[PDB]
Subunit: 329 residues, 4 copies
């Protein structure tokens, strides 16, 4: 019964487990932190910036792709401004080799068919949704995220199916889900990238009010096991304590983790600067100065596990559970 | 062997689990918060105000009755003064009674358009003589609460009430065992209040007894359902997220006590010192804004789980255990 | 994998309420350790200098428990304390009021107040025991932190032989094999409690320790099937652990620290506010502390339908709480 | 991937077994190899802030093992690992008498160790040490995920087959064989050994010591090889636990951060070792025997005459995660 087999089911967070070290002939220099989400969406680092208005504008989106990651423009702005941001990220020096100057010192840039760097944009389910997407695709966007707090509402699985039949070339990133059965629902709907983030962090703290949610580690693990039957990558929204948890997330079966908070202090994020230092997280600095901490930490984490790439990381991953007594320290 | 088998019983409270979502066609607005306790005892929201001295009198009950819930008028004053308060919540509406229906659409009344009201009665020697006045004031639910919750003493006075005049709804508590929940049902109980031990009632520090509430609710609700009997969960409800768990654990309604303390509709004088008012404790204010909050978020939880009514919620209720670092 | 076994304390469990036919009046909280060792309350004062001397032994007896005279004193001076207790109540006409004054007082066949003693485990021990039985002391203890000590067993073998009719309380143990070895030494009463890290540092420096619910159950099981009672040493914070310890199989609960600042403690008094010196503030009479415990014991067994302690530990039903139980 | 359990030191308590042993009898004398016979199961960590030549002298005086730290030139390296060798021969009778428990070589010269890196430089460093009659070297690093360690060990082993190469640092069974079959007669156990460990996130990997120690000591004992605990130990109880878990010797640094012999300056009315300012902890002999006592005390309750006695005979239980600090 669905009233008998419920209670015993156990959940798990990132902090509750540790990755078991392996015989490593692999070094952080050698390791590959690249993941393929699509032909269009070829990332060189497993990171995406959230589509938050306090996280990613055009100033922020460019910085991510310059490194090799991905920027998701926020939907909390007029389409005119929104459609411009995407193409502004697309027009910086993107789509041409003419500016070798920009090619000269951003080694691991992630790019599309035209050699343009990759940018994504958030699209709401608010009633005039398609018009907000027609401007972005024609702004040559590479991806859009149809996400709500109702991240698995029929309406949010609706405007996914209403787009795939409409658009051949658009990569639909869907979310958020918490279960493997909810992963399939998005994928069958027309989702080539699935996002896991129900009660991920404080982004949708419905645990205290709605009382709903699934522990992120298991949420990442379960969904990834289902999305692999279609070769579809998953996005690890929230749950991350530090970059050591990136190592735990990318081993559960994830291709990319997406972050918001860690971008609250960088200069490329929206927020009037002030010399003490705070925006309108106080300050963090250049995005290039924060990224290598995330990457370096992941490099050694898989250099510890003998993972050359992110694929072998998942196939040959074993965890070990910590007791609830002395885990905080 | 109650010596070599006792140890393995593991318990759980609401703050140890989470409700797993479902493929939801259902959304908050559509869902129905309505809940039925009996023939004359039926609500529109799964909320009752506890029978405490600082929480519920005629003032609180009227608001609760109109908001769709129920109030339980305490047993610590004159019988006539408990009779004076009941009918006051009864003669609020009496059927060309028109204006108040527009005031709030969720009103919970009887078959004669009269707002429902409950009341606790002590289980002492002069109980039935105090219930005596309550049944004349047409109270819709009597509560048999005592420092002794399930013990034989409380079961005695359910047999006496039901055997003599069986018109009224007998609510009795508290139980924690399925065996205990059923025993009152056989006595004459129609709705059962569940809750022995909150984890900080306060009967675990210097008594060492009790049952974790989440398990206590499930264990009682499962057994009571064998007789088609509804149950009330009493205690363990920390916030808005735990009500949904309590409601998914099997409970029909969720009775809250201290949550309605500083609420404006609580009995007692009002004292102002700061800006925010205070009670003779933070003046919460109009009961609605808290109740609306308690149900406006409840719709989200059910919408997440894809339930249009409290029915679907329990049949397909799925939980997930909070691990070690998840507790923190 | 020799790590799997789980050890519980009283902080790890609760008692599940049972069907009760017992009111707080009906229970007998009387307890027997031996034919010459019977008590009216399941309490013992620890054999410490901050805890028990003559007056504490008198007071504890006058409440129904047993006082264990501590051995940090001369051989003559320990016999002196024993003397006072035995000559406390004649059994005649002069001391009848005390019988009226304290109904629950525990005594021997000749109406003399029961008193326990305590000795070391050296060559000097017998010469101390000499003076103790000379003034007719009832119980004797040879207690330290050591668990399966070979030294204590050697003494019990020597003490029981010299005095076949004497209540030897050895301790402390936390294993069945050790408890089995003590009964195999001639003892008839067992102290149980090795390394409760909640209070002492046995676990910190030695790494050795046993959680006090596991130790009690493991020892009470081994001792019971040979007609032997046990005592739970260390790990009781209030009435809660006490009831849990008694249901775990323990006949008596020995307390020292909690009793340390009581009026009958050997500690001196000085002021403002009252305090007990040589540090602990002042509480009051031992009687208040006792009926803060025993009264709660009547409440604990009451929710369980037990009318006697035998009824309790036989039909005890433990529930194992969850991780976030007290935290929330 | 997730049901696998890992235990720390705070997870375990040692359970008292047949105490047929007493501290006047028990031996903490531990062996690593024929040329490495220790009298106390401790090893100083080769760190800038832990071991100098002076510290290597005092450590061995009690029968431990001082590993000279790497962060110096090869010149001043071998100068330090030669001072300890010619610190005493029996030429000075009292200087031999004053420290009877001392650990020594064939000529009665103090036992020494030298911290050596993986790299191309190391052979020149190692050879300079073997010229200074070094007893052992440690080829350990957190940079061990470059298998150069394994490459170096055998490389060094081929050249020096009578050398006491200490390899590390591992925490799994399959990596143990990799080190052992590489020629490492001593294998270091531990990944994540910080007083606070941040490598589990900053670097990104780690495993609880008790699990690490026990598991690595399983395959290491199947083919006769002793394991060693690195850091990870805070109290004397932590010593007894992992030792019983199949370990022969424990390594510490931070705990002995501000000793007299430890590198650092003594400043001031209180004394502080500016080694980051660590208060004075006394002579090494003092800060050591506050452990060995508790170590001898832990084996007593278990009833072990030695560590092999302890390793074989000891068994473990598990505490509860619900309360640990609050229940203390």
């Amino acid at each position: 019964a669905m009233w008998e087999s419920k209670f015993v089911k156990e959940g798990l967070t990132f902090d509750d487990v540790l990755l078991v070290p392996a015989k490593s002939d692999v070094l952080p220099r050698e390791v590959s932190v690249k993941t393929v989400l699509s032909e269009s969406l070829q990332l060189n680092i497993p990171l995406i910036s959230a589509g938050m208005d306090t996280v990613t504008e055009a100033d922020m989106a460019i910085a991510m792709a310059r490194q090799g990651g991905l920027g998701i423009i926020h939907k909390n702005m007029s389409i005119e401004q929104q459609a411009e941001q995407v193409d502004k990220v697309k027009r910086s020096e993107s789509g041409g080799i003419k500016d070798i100057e920009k090619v000269i010192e951003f080694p691991n840039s992630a790019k599309d068919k035209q050699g343009r760097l990759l940018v994504g944009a958030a699209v709401g389910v608010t009633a005039d949704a398609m018009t907000r997407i027609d401007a972005l695709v024609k702004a040559s966007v590479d991806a859009i995220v149809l996400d709500t707090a109702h991240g698995h509402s029929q309406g949010v699985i609706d405007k996914v199916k209403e787009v795939r039949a409409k658009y051949p070339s658009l990569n639909i990133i869907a979310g958020n889900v918490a279960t493997a059965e909810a992963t399939k629902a998005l994928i069958e709907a027309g989702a080539n990238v699935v996002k896991v983030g129900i009660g991920p962090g404080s982004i949708c703290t419905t645990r205290v009010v709605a009382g709903v949610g699934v522990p992120q580690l298991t949420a990442v693990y379960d969904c990834a096991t289902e999305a692999r039957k279609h070769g579809i990558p998953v996005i690890a929204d929230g749950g991350i304590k530090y970059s050591g948890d990136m190592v735990k997330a990318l081993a559960a079966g994830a291709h990319v983790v997406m972050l918001g908070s860690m971008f609250a202090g960088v200069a490329e994020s929206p927020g009037e600067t002030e010399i003490r230092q705070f925006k309108v997280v106080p300050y963090k600095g250049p995005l290039a100065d924060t990224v290598h901490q995330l990457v370096g930490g992941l490099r050694a984490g898989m250099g510890y596990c003998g993972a050359q790439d992110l694929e072998f990381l998942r196939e040959n991953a074993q965890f070990i559970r910590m007791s609830g007594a002395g885990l905080l320290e």
